[PDB]
Amino acid sequence: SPQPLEQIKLSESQLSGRVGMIEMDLASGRTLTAWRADERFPMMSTFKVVLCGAVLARVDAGDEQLERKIHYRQQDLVDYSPVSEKHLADGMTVGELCAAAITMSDNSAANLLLATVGGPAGLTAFLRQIGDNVTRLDHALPGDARDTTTPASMAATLRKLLTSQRLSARSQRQLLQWMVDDRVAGPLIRSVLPAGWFIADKTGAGERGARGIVALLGPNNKAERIVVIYLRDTPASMAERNQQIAGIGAALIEHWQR
Ligand SMILES: OC[C@H]1O[C@H](O[C@H]2[C@H](O)[C@@H](O)[C@H](OCCCCCCC3CCCCC3)O[C@@H]2CO)[C@H](O)[C@@H](O)[C@@H]1O
Ligand SMILES: *C(=O)/C=C/N[C@@H](C(=O)O)[C@](C)(COC(=O)CCCC(=O)O)S(=O)O
């Protein structure tokens, strides 16, 4: 593979789309690679990690419990509810809702959780409170800033949730574990990663070719770096979008020591 930046450029050329990317040391926030890092991209399902960060902040504050059982009705379900559709009789705990939202991208779970943090306005206020003045949730054509972030903002926000003292030790540990447990792409990624490489992640997909991943990655079985990659405005097949992101991954892996 070529160098990371060379591969990012090749991916834009092949996809006819915009790629946005940050590679960041998790412990320190050192930025290693930045490409369109201040440009806006649709977050898609990647917002679910930030959502559950806000849920954990309420738990830490004494205003929520991960144990608390939420009962919901079939009429409350929205499109794509692979876990939540199974619990109409018995409900789900707030913690289970977060696990379903992050690890399965369960939309009904995310919707229920979003209500608890005061909707999109409430989540946006949470972001402003932790110093993210860029990311916004309002609920995919160009010029629409709704439900968007930048690679730099998302990376900084994820770092703050995972490592700063904004969340309790236990809550940091929980948020990381939900990402380790991703079922959408985690096992697939492991299957193609060389031995010794740690992965935790949340994926996203959307209209007009939108595709993305927020991940922790590193050799020696350590979450050494945050990697955020967003694609937008490409007509490419999902398989091709996946392959291009994987290719950027390969360039990082082959050329890690920078
Ligand atoms: O340094 C040489 C390494 O190169 C290859 O590994 C290949 C691997 O066989 C391939 O499957 C992967 O594809 C990349 C798959 C990445 C999966 C997605 C990555 C995500 C994670 C972070 C956020 C965005 C991308 O590339 C690497 C590097 O060439 C060899 O197989 C391996 O033995 C060796 O250790
Ligand atoms: C989050 O990114 C959601 C993406 N797409 C869903 C949606 O728009 O609600 C779909 C229902 C597809 O969902 C999936 O394939 C699950 C995995 C999505 C993910 O990568 O998180 S819609 O058909 O696009």
SS3 of residue 213 by DSSP = strand
Contact in structure between 175 and 201 (CB atoms under 8 Å)? no
Report the 10 Å Cβ neighbour count for 124: 17
Feature table: binding site for a beta-lactam: 48, 105
Task: Say how far apart CA 179 and CA 240 lie, in whole Å.
Answer: 24
Catalytic residue IDs: 45
Token pair for 43: 């977050």
Contact in structure between 241 and 231 (CB atoms under 8 Å)? yes
Q: What is the CA radius of gyration of the chain?
A: 18
Query: Smallest Cα–Cα separation from 22: which of 6, 9, 3, 5?
Result: 5
Ligand 1 atom 32, closest CA: 194
Determination technique used:
X-ray
| CB of 213 closer than 6 angstroms to any ligand 2 atom | no
DSSP 39: S
Per the structure, the count of domains in the chain is 1
Q: Which atom of ligand 1 is nearest to the CA of 185?
A: 18
Task: Say how far apart CA 192 and CA 158 lie, in whole Å.
Answer: 25
The dihedrals phi and psi of 63, each to the nearest 5 degrees, come to -100, 0
Q: What is the dihedral of CA 223, 226, 230, 236, to 10 degrees?
A: -30
Helices 151-163, 169-180: inter-axial angle, 10-degree rounding: 130
Residue 139 CA from chain centroid, whole number:
17
Q: What CATH number is associated with residue 173?
A: 3.40.710.10
Sign of the torsion angle spanned by Cα atoms 23, 24, 25, 26: negative
Beta strand 225-232 with 18-25: parallel, antiparallel or unpaired? antiparallel
Residue keyed to tokens 């030790």: 169
Ligand 2 atom 14, closest CA: 105
Ligand 1 probe mutation, 7, 182, 192, most atoms within 8 A of CB:
192
The residue segments making up the domain with residue 250 are 1-258
Contact in structure between 179 and 201 (CB atoms under 8 Å)? yes
DSSP 99: H
Greatest pairwise CA separation for the chain in angstroms: 53
DSSP 70: E
Contact in structure between 199 and 215 (CB atoms under 8 Å)? yes
In order of 59, 88, 107, the CA distances from 85 in angstroms are 25, 6, 10
In order of 123, 189, 237, the CA distances from 14 in angstroms are 36, 22, 12
